Amino acid sequence: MESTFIMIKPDGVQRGLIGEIISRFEKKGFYLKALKLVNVERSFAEKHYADLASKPFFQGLVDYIISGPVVAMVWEGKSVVTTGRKIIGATNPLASEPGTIRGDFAVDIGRNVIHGSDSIESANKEIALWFPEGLADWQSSQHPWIYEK
Amino acid sequence: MESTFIMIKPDGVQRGLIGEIISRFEKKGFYLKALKLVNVERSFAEKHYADLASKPFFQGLVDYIISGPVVAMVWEGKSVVTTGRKIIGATNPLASEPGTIRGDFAVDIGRNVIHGSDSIESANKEIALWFPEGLADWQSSQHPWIYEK
Amino acid sequence: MESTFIMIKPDGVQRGLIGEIISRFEKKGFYLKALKLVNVERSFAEKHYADLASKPFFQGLVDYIISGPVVAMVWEGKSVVTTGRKIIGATNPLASEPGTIRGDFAVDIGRNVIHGSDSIESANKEIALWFPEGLADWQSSQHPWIYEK
Amino acid sequence: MESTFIMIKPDGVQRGLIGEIISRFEKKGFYLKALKLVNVERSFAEKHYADLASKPFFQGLVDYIISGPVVAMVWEGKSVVTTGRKIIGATNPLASEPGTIRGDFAVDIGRNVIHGSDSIESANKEIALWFPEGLADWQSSQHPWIYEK
Amino acid sequence: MESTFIMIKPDGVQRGLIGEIISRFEKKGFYLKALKLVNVERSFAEKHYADLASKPFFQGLVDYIISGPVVAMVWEGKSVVTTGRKIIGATNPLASEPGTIRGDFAVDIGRNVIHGSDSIESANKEIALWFPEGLADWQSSQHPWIYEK
Amino acid sequence: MESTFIMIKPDGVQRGLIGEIISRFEKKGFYLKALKLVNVERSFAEKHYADLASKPFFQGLVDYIISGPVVAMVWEGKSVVTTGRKIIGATNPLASEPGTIRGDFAVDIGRNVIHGSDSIESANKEIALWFPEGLADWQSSQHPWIYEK
Incomplete structure (x- = not known):
């Protein structure tokens, strides 16, 4: 029931790797609980990269992540x-x-x-940031074969 | 520049086919312009299958699409x-x-x-229904190799 | 619940296609109920192809199938x-x-x-011939997502 | 000519990984010499796991392995x-x-x-337990490109 | 022993389909007898598309084939x-x-x-034009499992 | 702009691995600049392995590499x-x-x-030896998504 934030970056979209990436996580046995293709604006980008605001490459990080759609996932x-x-x-x-x-x-x-x-704390923060609306919950019929007990 | 609505149904999610399906459209050279995992509610399901409301199986269609999350795509x-x-x-x-x-x-x-x-007509309608929020636009650097002129 | 007999011939084994072939049936949603790697003797081969003994390339079918191990499946x-x-x-x-x-x-x-x-009647004959020891029964937890009702 | 015992457990069967698993061993250049899908009996499973008999999670292993069919291979x-x-x-x-x-x-x-x-010693033991009837026999046409000498 | 000319166009190269394309011919059981990545010169392209010289799309064909390297194969x-x-x-x-x-x-x-x-006539012509240096010869160890007799 | 020489040995060609190998390099984001199927002759083999001329296994290496065609690549x-x-x-x-x-x-x-x-030193020597004719020139449309700046 632990959850993590996975984002496909603009280059991943441009290079046609969206499906491939999702498949790795699916075949591993993990459950996709949120998903959206989104164009990010600066102000949101600045919050996502907040830990790095004082870094000299901060502006490049923001400039890049807004330059193309990304795929955000839980x-x-x-x-x-x-x-x-x-x-x-x-x-x-x-x-x-x-x-x-x-x-x-x-x-x-x-x-x-x-x-x-x-990290778990980064994940809880990232998920709250990217998916305020919450998750699309479901229960996998394969749960008893992926997990014990 | 033509667009269409494509939905992975609840069984697609459960059977772990999300990435595989997306890869097929990506490799074909099509451009993903919207994407989300969602739990559908009755009245929305009823609007989506509106054209079939008079059919005996209508109810079944609605029950099923609401029984598990789907992946909506443009x-x-x-x-x-x-x-x-x-x-x-x-x-x-x-x-x-x-x-x-x-x-x-x-x-x-x-x-x-x-x-x-x-059809183009029903697609336009389905896109407006599923993605009121609009699309995530971008331009592929592979465009000149996928398309002539 | 219908069943059929699928056999990978000696060339399928030699060319390393066993897994690929099995994956195709699995991905389709079919249920593997029996499976074995077998060397076939001529009299058994003749029984398998019994409904063709009158033909000239009967000997041809028989010689082929005894030329290396086969993978027998239900x-x-x-x-x-x-x-x-x-x-x-x-x-x-x-x-x-x-x-x-x-x-x-x-x-x-x-x-x-x-x-x-x-055909169904051929399948029943073939299954009886290759698997008199019976099938390995199980219920797939994905059944309700592969089939309706 | 060294041989080992490989077993796809019930979750591998249920999660549709049989063909994929076989393909990995085929592509590596290894030779499949025995194969069967089987429902495992409780006292048989107790023997297979004998070396772990005085361990705590022993009964769990035995309970689990007979809960669905497995694919036994050499x-x-x-x-x-x-x-x-x-x-x-x-x-x-x-x-x-x-x-x-x-x-x-x-x-x-x-x-x-x-x-x-x-280990080689466990392999010999497991092979004697699971395939007392012995192996199918064949020689790969790729032998001289997989091996030297 | 029949032979054909297969050429991956510049878009095939740009979209990273070289290996995928070759794999499909390898898996089918065909034998690669000639292979080169080449930049095509305008007058060579004019010769390749000679039979279409009177057509109004001729120049566009010539421009396109020389806009990138191609993979020429037999x-x-x-x-x-x-x-x-x-x-x-x-x-x-x-x-x-x-x-x-x-x-x-x-x-x-x-x-x-x-x-x-x-066609066979076209193949012979294309092979002579693209590979006057001839072919690399070899015999596949898989021949007797790909072909009968 | 660093370059390297990669050669699929005779066994790779016999085992039908040519496309699979190329795909791995394309997917990683590297650029194919030279490619050809070759029958290596003894005196050339001796040049390629010149660095090992004093080794006892030198002649073995030479014998093998001329036994079947190879795929040379940059x-x-x-x-x-x-x-x-x-x-x-x-x-x-x-x-x-x-x-x-x-x-x-x-x-x-x-x-x-x-x-x-x-090494870069070996790569330069190998590229000079196998591809005196030079490399194909082209610029990938993906470059700005594979490389920053």
């Missing part, structure tokens, strides 16, 4: 926060192992295809 | 309304071709995984 | 007999459409990868 | 025992690397999809 | 000419069937991803 | 030399991780499917 499951980062791979795509999303698809840190919450 | 491209439906495949399982979405995944007309607009 | 589902044949594609892989098993993988009628029962 | 090839384990991934899916079977597909240690022999 | 196998064309699918994207290359990837007749010889 | 991108080797996986398939080319496909060090340049 995924739910056991250890989905840390396992979500494992699926995504390392920060630098070139250090990311084949088999991970960044390992298979990315080469440039500034074009790293996807974002995943770095 | 796709844009040349002839996307009919080509969208070609990729989806015939309604009747006996008539579906291997290589289409229903040809590959569906065995029951009542569990047909996905549904696309019949 | 698949269960709505219209699985006809649908099984549709997925397999035309007998002459030259006429087989891309998206079918023979359309994707085969070029020669004498190496056409796989066999599916041609 | 695979042959150089270092197939250790390499089969490498393909399968870490026991705890929390640790399993993307690109491995459990890394790609599993989230719960109690629903970890598949089993492979842990 | 494939060999039974009925490879007509089957090559079948794998490629209909010229017009409103007609291309899902499961074919154009069916799966193309939406515009002017950006149709790939070319295949339309 | 790929370009950020850190493509080291990244190429990462995608390919460990030299010994006992160590190669699932997700890498050798991880997924190879089991014998002597049949390790593919080779990539081990």
